């Protein structure tokens, strides 16, 4: 399937134990896609002071369209030193490894895979 319905646990930035996916744009996108498939991916909602507490490169989920079965259609965009690899809509948040942090909410997304 080109799209996959996922429910992403929303984590508080200060609870996050593994603050990024790796050390290159290509690696973080690779790793983010693998974690999304494996159900080991969390979402941090971006506000003032969140991104400096996480590790670059960042992986964003961005709205790709204006929402089947409650699932917002999203795609992945990476960012390193203020340059983004991908073009998409509004940020729903920044992806991180999920290693058992207690979420505050769930974000239903349809991921272009």
CATH class of 3-112: mainly beta
Contact partners, residue 93, CB within 8 Å, separation at least 6: 10, 43, 44, 45, 46, 60, 61, 107
Q: What angle is formed at CA 69 by the lines to CA 91 and CA 36, rounded to 5 degrees?
A: 50
CA within 13 Å, CB half, 57:
22
The b/e string for 40-51 (b: 16+ C-beta within 10 A; e otherwise) is ebbbbbbeeebb
3-class state of residue 79 by DSSP: strand
Torsion sign over Cα 69, 36, 38, 42: negative
The domain ranges of the chain are 3-112
Distance CA 110, CA 53 (A): 27
Helices (H), ranges, 15-97: 25-38
Distance CA 64, CA 101 (A): 28
Enter the resolution in angstroms: 2.0
- Among candidate residues 80, 93, 111, the one with its CA nearest the CA of residue 16: 93
């Amino acid at each position: 399937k080109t799209h996959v319905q996922l429910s992403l646990p929303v984590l508080q930035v200060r609870d996050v134990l593994v603050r990024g996916f790796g050390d290159s744009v290509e690696e973080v996108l690779s790793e983010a896609r693998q974690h999304l498939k494996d159900g080991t991916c969390g979402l941090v909602e971006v506000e003032k002071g969140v991104l400096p507490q996480l590790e670059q490169p960042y992986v964003f989920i961005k709205r790709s369209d204006a929402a089947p079965h409650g699932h917002v259609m999203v795609e992945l965009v990476a960012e390193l030193e203020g340059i983004q690899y991908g073009r998409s809509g509004e940020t729903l948040g920044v992806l991180v490894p999920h290693v058992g942090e207690i979420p505050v909410a769930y974000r239903k997304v349809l991921l272009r895979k």
